[PDB]
């Protein structure tokens, strides 16, 4: 295996969960997001780290990496945390601590 | 298969 | 990532590396303010562990980087490790990130958001480049 | 939020 020294990234599409399903089944879950199988894939050291998406000049935290192919597989999606599903629990957890 | 990233 | 390229330095300002005490660099995050850090709830930080902000090559000595400890860790009463759901972890910091260049926050989404099948995102990291 | 001063290259 290598590991980089210096910061990588990569553009990769989103998927809908539903077709996210003909590689997954029932693992995917609404609080995930699947992007990829593009030819990239997020791998081992990558997780808990940012999927942000571009709209209207910023950039905006759509998906924290979390877990896909034990191989790395370029060719099946990655599955990231939904942050639409999570970002609720997020902003009260910051305004009550 | 699966695996956390 | 697995063929990836690598990023401009500092261009992505709100990440992170979550170390451990031995400096080995095991997660991402992203900082969303000065004072927090969201990650993934798999990624087992705790108090022990430490946040660096504003690194760009991690065999380099000669960048600023803040190495910020963690006062507390927020996993998501939510997550589900055997399902690998609702996987996200707040850290609060012992002492803010200071705000610079190479250190600043990513936005936050309206929990109704559409992020629609297609779009064409980024993701950023440390992991490996071959498996 | 958001803009990073050293802008992205993809």
């Known amino acids: 295996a290598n590991t980089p020294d210096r910061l990588q990234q990569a553009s990769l599409p989103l998927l809908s969960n539903t077709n996210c399903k003909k590689y997954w089944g029932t693992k995917i879950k609404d609080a995930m997001i699947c992007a990829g199988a593009s030819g990239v894939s997020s791998c081992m050291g990558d997780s808990g780290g940012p999927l942000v998406c571009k709209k209207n000049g910023a950039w905006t935290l759509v998906g924290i990496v979390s877990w896909g192919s034990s191989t790395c597989s370029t060719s099946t999606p990655g599955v990231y945390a939904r942050v639409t599903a999570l970002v609720n629990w997020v902003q009260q957890t910051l305004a009550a601590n | ?5 | 990532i697995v063929n990836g390229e690598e990023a401009v330095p500092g261009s992505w300002p709100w990440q992170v590396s979550l170390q451990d005490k031995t400096g080995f660099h095991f997660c991402g995050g992203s900082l969303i303010n000065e004072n927090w850090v969201v990650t993934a709830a798999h990624c087992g930080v705790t108090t022990s562990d430490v946040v660096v902000a504003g690194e760009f090559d991690q065999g380099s000595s000669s960048e600023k980087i803040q190495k910020l400890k963690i006062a507390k860790v927020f996993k998501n009463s939510k997550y589900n490790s055997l399902t690998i759901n609702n996987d996200i972890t707040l850290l609060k910091l012992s002492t803010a990130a200071s705000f610079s260049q190479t250190v600043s926050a990513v936005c936050l989404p309206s929990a109704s958001d559409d992020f629609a099948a297609g779009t064409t995102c980024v993701t950023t990291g440390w992991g490996l480049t071959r498996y | 939020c958001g803009v990073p001063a050293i802008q992205p290259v993809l």
């Open chain 2, 1 to 5: 298969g699966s695996w956390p990233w």
